[PDB]
Design an enzyme around this catalytic site. Structure first.
Site, PDB file in Angstrom:
ATOM      1  N   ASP A  96     -11.483  -3.480  -3.725  1.00 58.35           N
ATOM      2  CA  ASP A  96     -10.360  -4.261  -4.233  1.00 58.35           C
ATOM      3  C   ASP A  96     -10.565  -4.637  -5.697  1.00 58.35           C
ATOM      4  OD1 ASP A  96     -10.148  -5.278  -1.007  1.00 58.35           O
ATOM      5  OD2 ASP A  96      -8.313  -4.674  -2.040  1.00 58.35           O
ATOM      6  N   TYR A 113      -4.393  -7.531   3.137  1.00 60.45           N
ATOM      7  CA  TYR A 113      -5.425  -8.540   3.088  1.00 60.45           C
ATOM      8  C   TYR A 113      -5.159  -9.587   2.025  1.00 60.45           C
ATOM      9  CZ  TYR A 113      -8.637  -7.211   6.669  1.00 60.45           C
ATOM     10  OH  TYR A 113      -9.216  -7.031   7.915  1.00 60.45           O
TER      11      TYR A 113
HETATM   12  O1  LIG Z   1      -6.736  -3.360  -0.449  1.00 66.27           O
HETATM   13  C1  LIG Z   1      -6.355  -2.153  -1.048  1.00 66.27           C
HETATM   14  C2  LIG Z   1      -5.860  -1.180   0.028  1.00 66.27           C
HETATM   15  C3  LIG Z   1      -4.354  -1.345   0.279  1.00 66.27           C
HETATM   16  C4  LIG Z   1      -3.474  -1.402  -0.793  1.00 66.27           C
HETATM   17  C5  LIG Z   1      -2.112  -1.546  -0.565  1.00 66.27           C
HETATM   18  C6  LIG Z   1      -1.632  -1.635   0.738  1.00 66.27           C
HETATM   19  C7  LIG Z   1      -2.518  -1.594   1.811  1.00 66.27           C
HETATM   20  C8  LIG Z   1      -3.877  -1.441   1.584  1.00 66.27           C
HETATM   21 CU   LIG Z   2     -11.729  -7.861   8.344  1.00 66.22          CU
END
Ligand SMILES: O=CCc1ccccc1
Ligand SMILES: [Cu+2]
Ligand SMILES: O=CCc1ccccc1
Ligand SMILES: [Cu+2]
Ligand code: NA
Ligand code: NA
Ligand code: NA
Ligand code: NA
Lengths: 620, 620
Positions: B290, B374
């Site tokens: 992230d 998340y």
């Molecule tokens: O956390 C980055 C992965 C992600 C990015 C955008 C949507 C779902 C999952």
């Molecule tokens: Cu988790």
């Protein structure tokens, strides 16, 4: 009407009258422990019988007694003479704290040791410490305390700053004899004071702290009925109080829809031990069991509004017995309040456009106890999301010694000439489990790493494994932080909507357990402390991990004796005993009064609910 | 005037104008990262030069550039063309989030897969996930995202409840080609909704919660000067903000008497990774960084008074650049407030008669970020007693899959047909240490158990040992909870009044590190995550444990490359990198929106002060 109500002053007065009339409470008798007995299993017969267990000491050397009385029927149920060489001595009496100093003050050997040090006997305080069981054959069957000395320069002086090292005495407090005075040599008595309220030491007090005001304009969210029954945010429980254990939690349950679901039948801190790691003969015997030897509940503090407990506080004032059977109130001895606990759940969704935030809170149930130099706060926490947490807060003044010229591998230096021996603070939580009822099992859960290869070609997979503990002989478990080890208590006969057994996961802090050599006296007397987790089959008389009479017991009692029965624990009425502790290498910052340090554990739901249980929490 | 002040809108406008005039910001360019550079070591020459680092992407396929500009002098300092096959791709752009869904919506293979499932393409959301580096030779040097699909039944629906398993696509977002569509078979799309604001799912909202009011009638105890310089209860620090790292703490220092004593020069969360442990080819490539790949700072939430932050809140509103170099304010993106934190110290003394109680408090600095499903809260805490603590709070919605008929060893079931693959959340804290200045060393401290025998006749002694880490090749360390392992950062040239080096002790949570096979792609790209502690010699360009360009980098960059220099770290300018994380086996209670779970670390003074530093706290 509840069988789990706190003991009343009237009940304790009745016990006293019953014992007196039976000839059990003459002038030479002292009550060393008095406590209400829990209802036996299956009390659904509506036959209340309030029963009290009493340990009766005799100051003239007669054998002590264990007595059970019924206050509802006004009778002595049973009365047993104790052979203390066999089963252990009774807990230390508060009135014995001063007897050790008084007996030493007229002993020629003691006086000669103080005279060589130019110490005035009227300024010498003696700490009354439990004796343990070591090599002294003359101590078997006698009530012994050991004394270590500290100088008080003036009545308001902190004696802990002035230990008198190289000197220890042993005393028989019933025959009133000083059995041994050991003097291994003269150490300078550390001279700096430790008076943490002296302006010379504190400097000018800060003026920079602005007040924080915590109020509940509409009052608290919890209700108290029947003196000690709490309902809060779908939780319900009874708050008990025992002079040995302190605050005890009964019948912890959670209201899930229209069903009241049990989780824990009884939760308590059932023992604690402080072993010292200094090999000096002045202190190498030093291990105190604050709960088992001294009874932490009788030293509970009265807690002050705005200082000890902040916010909208509801108090309980439990009643205990003094040594003569008179009721004594501990005014404001238990604080209860709810606290904001930050964010509970939060999500901002890129596709739905919905922004969602909810706040968490917890219910706090706490008391504080003081035994000599040490002070401890015991905190039970219930959270909105089904988590249960315990936290011990350790503060007070560290136990001191001289710091030897040339240093030490077992003592840290706090001030010029002043040492603090290494030690641990180890607790035992006894959790009489009742996850959706009494048919419970324990599983040990480990992370499982997987090898790169067929079925895992990119080497990213990992998994977990669960091992059922089926009999007591296999239910003595060690922590393993590296494999993320936890333990799950489940009900194999109660399933969630996914047809999985409901459960709760115990998360430990994975701190070191008892460090002493496994052949030591303390390893035998505090055997519970050598392992992180024990599981036993419930039994009425299996109350403490160290047995009923810890003082001067030779060892093996409690958990090692219980688990030898090798009883079935797979889908049965079981009890979890979790050992957790702090290993304390004292730092300069712990002197002259210690900032709080903490240790504990928590239990979180593990497929107990069919979905998050806090979806009905409002936006506030 | 401070060189550590937050970037201003005017500074970012100047950077844009400078890049535009230099020919570096035409219509095909996008700013993928923009951030202010820290002052170089020894900036005591009073020569301020505000410099910004920029990563410039080209949407037409030209090579990206790394550019450093000085806004004080209005010049381009350097500009370098990047070979992304060698050194890694640039971070994902926000505007690419929608490109993956749009390109798939016209690809025949994608449409055939949805048609077989009777899914309307207008209802199918595609998550834009980072690609990593695996076996696909055609991806080297190209900008690839991978897409996983979720159904939204209506615009306000939570798509996460409806994963489309058995289907994944890879897309080149610069050439706008769908390189591969992989369909391993049809899974039922889980049908239950996950709409945690739907009254059908929440039931009636609780009416039992009474308000908790937290106010400061005289205002807060901390002051903010120069936009971002905090002084609180002898602490002082600067609060920075970077689009990649988020909140950054500079110049943490503590006022001890008349001396301002440095502790930490720069503190940040410098990387985080979420590796998934599901071996299905639909997800076995899934690991997102992230911080390094998406930049957590640009997705910081605006925090709402009374919901996200409760009490007397002071806000900072940091400014970042959008993709075209325009300044953009994150309104109320950082909360700052102080909190009551229970008892600080307490003692009731049996001999002096003095009863003493003081209350603790902490300063809180926090922000919240959202990246897809998340959400994370990042909390920095400063306590009265010199402790520094970090806490990550994880919530949001778990990433979902189908739950296979017949179960899974790598996925847990949340609802009928609905799974959640196992995964970890692993963080890297970069602590540029400055304990009383820059000459620092790290010691590893283990408990030492001793054998019963001569000099330890009662078998009670225990001790500790400290090992100095002298060079980088020996400074890659693992946790050991069983031996109570901690690490001490000390200054060998600065001693307390006991002539001992001043220090701080790092306490870890001792959670499992990266579980993946050490031969995996993720173990090579997230090598920092395989060990709990790393120590490097400070260097200006050694900023991230994963290197500067994490997206699609083949591995080895960052910490493994740094420590190969094997530099002297014994009494030098050093940086501590601590890995800590959560291993997440999702539970039913995590669905449909996850209650907060936490992980972190803390540092406590270890002979840094000459005695307790909170003796001057008033009685309140
Ligand atoms: O956390 C980055 C992965 C992600 C990015 C955008 C949507 C779902 C999952
Ligand atoms: Cu988790
Ligand atoms: O905690 C029990 C040991 C003790 C009791 C009284 C004074 C000092 C130490
Ligand atoms: Cu201690
Ligand atoms: Na015996
Ligand atoms: Na039970
Ligand atoms: Na490469
Ligand atoms: Na440094």
């Amino acid at each position: 009407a509840s069988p789990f109500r706190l003991a009343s002053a009237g009940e304790i007065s009745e016990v006293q009258g019953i014992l007196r009339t039976a000839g059990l409470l003459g002038p030479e008798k002292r009550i060393a422990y008095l406590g209400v007995l829990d209802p036996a299993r299956g009390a659904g017969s509506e036959a209340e019988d309030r029963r009290f267990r009493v340990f009766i000491h005799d100051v003239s050397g007669a054998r002590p007694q264990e007595v059970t009385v019924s206050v509802t029927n006004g009778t002595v149920i049973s009365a047993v003479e104790l052979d203390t060489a066999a089963t252990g001595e009774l807990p230390v009496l508060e009135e014995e704290f001063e007897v050790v100093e008084q007996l030493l003050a007229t002993d020629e050997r003691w006086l000669k040791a103080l005279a060589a040090r130019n110490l005035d006997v009227s300024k010498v305080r003696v700490a009354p410490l439990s004796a343990g069981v070591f090599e002294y054959a003359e101590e078997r069957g006698r009530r012994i305390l050991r004394g270590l000395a500290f100088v008080q320069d003036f009545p308001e002086d902190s004696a802990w700053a002035h230990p008198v090292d190289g000197l220890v005495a042993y005393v028989d407090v019933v025959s009133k004899e000083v059995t041994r005075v050991i003097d291994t040599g003269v150490f300078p008595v550390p001279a700096e004071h430790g008076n943490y309220t002296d302006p010379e030491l504190t400097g000018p007090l800060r003026t920079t702290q602005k007040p924080i005001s915590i109020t509940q304009p509409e009052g608290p969210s919890f209700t108290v009925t029947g003196g000690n029954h709490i309902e809060w945010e779908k939780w319900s429980l009874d708050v008990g109080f025992d002079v040995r254990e302190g605050v005890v939690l009964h019948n912890i349950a959670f209201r899930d829809g229209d069903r009241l679901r049990p989780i824990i039948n009884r939760a308590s801190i059932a023992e604690m031990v402080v072993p010292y790691g200094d090999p000096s003969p002045i202190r190498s015997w030093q291990n105190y069991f604050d709960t088992g030897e001294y009874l932490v509940g009788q030293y509970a503090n009265s807690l002050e509004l705005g200082c000890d407990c902040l916010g909208d506080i509801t108090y309980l004032s439990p009643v205990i017995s003094d040594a003569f059977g008179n009721p004594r109130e501990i005014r404001n001895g238990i604080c209860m309040h709810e606290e904001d606990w930050g964010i509970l759940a939060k999500h901002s969704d890129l596709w739905s456009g919905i922004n969602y935030t909810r706040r968490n809170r917890r219910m706090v149930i706490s008391f504080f106890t003081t035994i000599g130099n040490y002070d401890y706060g015991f905190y039970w926490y219930l959270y909105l999301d089904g988590t249960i947490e315990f936290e011990a807060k350790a503060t007070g003044v560290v136990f001191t010694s001289a710091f030897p010229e040339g240093g030490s591998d077992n003592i840290s230096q706090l001030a010029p000439g002043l040492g603090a021996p290494f030690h641990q603070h180890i607790f035992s939580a006894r959790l009489d489990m009742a996850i959706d009822g009494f048919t419970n099992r324990v599983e040990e859960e480990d992370v499982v790493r997987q090898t790169m290869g067929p079925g895992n070609e990119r080497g990213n997979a990992f998994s977990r494994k669960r091992t059922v503990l089926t009999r007591e002989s296999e239910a003595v478990r060690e922590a393993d932080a590296r494999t993320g080890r936890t333990w799950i208590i489940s009900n194999p006969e109660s399933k969630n909507r996914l047809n999985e057994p409901v459960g709760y996961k115990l998360h430990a802090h994975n701190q070191p357990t008892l460090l002493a050599d496994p052949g030591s006296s303390i390893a035998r007397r505090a055997a519970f402390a050598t392992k992180d987790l024990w599981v036993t089959r419930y039994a009425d008389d299996e109350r403490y991990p160290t047995g009923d009479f810890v003082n001067q017991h030779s060892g093996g009692a409690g958990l090692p004796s219980y688990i030898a029965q090798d009883r079935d624990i797979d889908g049965q009425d079981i009890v979890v005993w979790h050992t957790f502790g702090l290993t304390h290498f004292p730092r300069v910052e712990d002197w002259p009064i210690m900032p709080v340090d903490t240790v504990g554990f928590k239990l979180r739901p593990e497929g107990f609910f069919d979905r998050s249980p806090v979806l009905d929490v409002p936006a506030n």
